[PDB]
């Protein structure tokens, strides 16, 4: 069976919007796993979690294979490879959190979906910066709902 590191897990603040409505979750517990496998091959995978300590059916996540990220490194016009991947993000979640108590945020966590509805749709889980002049997006992923593994 794969086993699991964790590299970060914290509650964090999120800014959930859909079309017409956007809400703040504050007890939102997202995680960073670094999993492996060994026998009968070496594989790594990043596994990218949500969940809501008050809200059993908010999950969202995102499992990411070594091979699998050169092209999400790409697609985002990353300039980290794989292994420094997790430190880039778990910076910019560090970032979020110290901004959390702010009424205008400098970095804000923001799990956008284009439908009116939370539903089995994808969602982006976006990393922005604010400032005077514009509106900065570090990092867009697309999330799916549910859990990574059943139940």
Known sequence: GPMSQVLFHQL???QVKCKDCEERRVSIRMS????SVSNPVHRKDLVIR????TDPFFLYNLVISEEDFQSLKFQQGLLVDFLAFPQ???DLLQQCTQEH???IPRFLLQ???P???????????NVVETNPEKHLT???LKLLPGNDVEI
């Open 101 to 103: 108590a702010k009424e």
């Open 32 to 35: 960073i796993e670094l999993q």
């Open 50 to 53: 949500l969940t809501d300590d």
């Open 111 to 113: 799990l956008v979906s």
């Open 88 to 90: 880039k993000f778990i």
């Open 12 to 14: 964090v603040p999120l």
């Open 138 to 140: 570090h990092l867009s």
């Open 115 to 125: 439908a009116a509805i939370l539903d089995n749709s994808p969602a982006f889980l």
